[PDB]
Ligand binder design. Structure first.
Ligand SMILES: CCCCCCCC(=O)OC[C@H](COP(=O)(O)OCC[N+](C)(C)C)OC(=O)CCCCCCC
Length: 131
């Protein structure tokens, strides 16, 4: 029926190791995986995505633009969803601050690719018309 598997044996060890903040005094715990699970379903997002390398990539997409005007809750999410994500992408980090950059820089490339051809506005061009 319902199969639960967020962090396997290996992901578990690394998880407990990773910290929420760079200059904090506490590491990651299940409390963060569950807390985000109950908060996800609230945003019309099933908690099953937390155990999917693809889901995280999506969940972060909605929080990315939200970070601008997000609250304490919205922030904590991007943090957890960030670490858990890197774990599913065969990525290794020490804290959330680092993992976050890995997710931001990874997307920065997509922008350069989807914003390289549309950057030559200047002299008048040619085009048909019927006026
Ligand atoms: C009882 C109140 C319900 C009001 C109506 C439902 C609102 C809702 O679904 O909010 C989530 C939000 C996008 O929602 P909307 O902005 O209402 O979408 C409008 C357009 N349609 C309906 C076509 C999809 O997108 C987000 O998830 C952004 C918030 C960050 C959370 C990300 C997951 C952690």
């Amino acid at each position: 029926g319902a199969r639960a598997s967020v962090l396997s044996g290996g992901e578990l060890d690394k998880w407990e190791k990773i910290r929420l903040r760079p200059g904090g005094k506490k590491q990651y715990k299940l409390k963060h995986i569950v807390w985000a699970s109950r908060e996800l379903e609230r945003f019309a997002v099933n908690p099953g995505l937390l155990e999917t390398s693809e889901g995280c990539r999506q969940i972060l997409g909605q929080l990315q633009p939200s970070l601008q005007t997000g609250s304490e809750e919205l922030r904590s999410l991007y943090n957890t969803i960030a670490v858990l994500y890197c774990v599913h992408q065969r990525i290794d980090v020490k804290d959330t601050k680092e993992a976050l950059d890995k997710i931001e820089e990874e997307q920065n490339k997509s922008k350069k690719k989807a914003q390289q051809a549309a950057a030559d506005t200047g002299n008048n061009s040619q085009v048909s018309q019927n006026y």
